[PDB]
Design a protein around this ligand. Sequence first.
Ligand SMILES: [Cl-]
Ligand SMILES: [Cl-]
Ligand SMILES: [Cl-]
Lengths: 41, 40, 41, 40, 41, 40
Amino acid sequence: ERRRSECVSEMLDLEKQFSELKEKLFRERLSQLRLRLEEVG
Amino acid sequence: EDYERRRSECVSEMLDLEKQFSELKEKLFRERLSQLRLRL
Amino acid sequence: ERRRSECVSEMLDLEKQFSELKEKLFRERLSQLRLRLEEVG
Amino acid sequence: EDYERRRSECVSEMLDLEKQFSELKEKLFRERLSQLRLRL
Amino acid sequence: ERRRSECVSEMLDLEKQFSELKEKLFRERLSQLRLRLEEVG
Amino acid sequence: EDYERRRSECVSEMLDLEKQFSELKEKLFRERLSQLRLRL
Ligand SMILES: [Cl-]
Ligand SMILES: [Cl-]
Ligand SMILES: [Cl-]
């Protein structure tokens, strides 16, 4: 179980970072699209 | 622009669902981590 | 390879659950949207 | 409502693609697990 | 750290393949939709 | 067909974001792998 818990801990720690990265990436694309929408009018 | 608008709606929808999924994945990871550490 | 197979087994077991969670989450949002669509008419 | 309709189409499209991806990820996990267990 | 690095190496190797699979899956669906769009006209 | 068009825009948007995410995930994996191998 120790090999298993160290693996799961590591992946939780990475997934926490991947989640933040994905949300920030989507938010930037959403902001870019909303700005472009405005610029066209 | 309908074009920019439709694309923004798609991205907003997926952004909101991703935020919720992330929570759920993190919940499941921590739950399993606890279970392994407590031999449950 | 044993440390590796225990890591992969653990992650397959989690990913099986994450997949179900993601599909159920998308399905609920799809049902909510279809109901709202109907309610507006 | 075009608004609710467009959003529902986006979510349905992504739901269907996610269901397929999940299958493929599970396939690859099991394949690698087998290979490691059989030293292949 | 060795149990941890072997776990992370394994998962990086899988995620590299999952990424390719996801992009190819999305591309095929995009091509199918664009063809259908054309066929309707 | 507006129908096929809207769906194609949603998929194209998500395809482009997925390609970028994959890069970022791979970057983070390699960075952590290096750090663990170098005890950093
Ligand atoms: Cl809403
Ligand atoms: Cl279809
Ligand atoms: Cl663009």
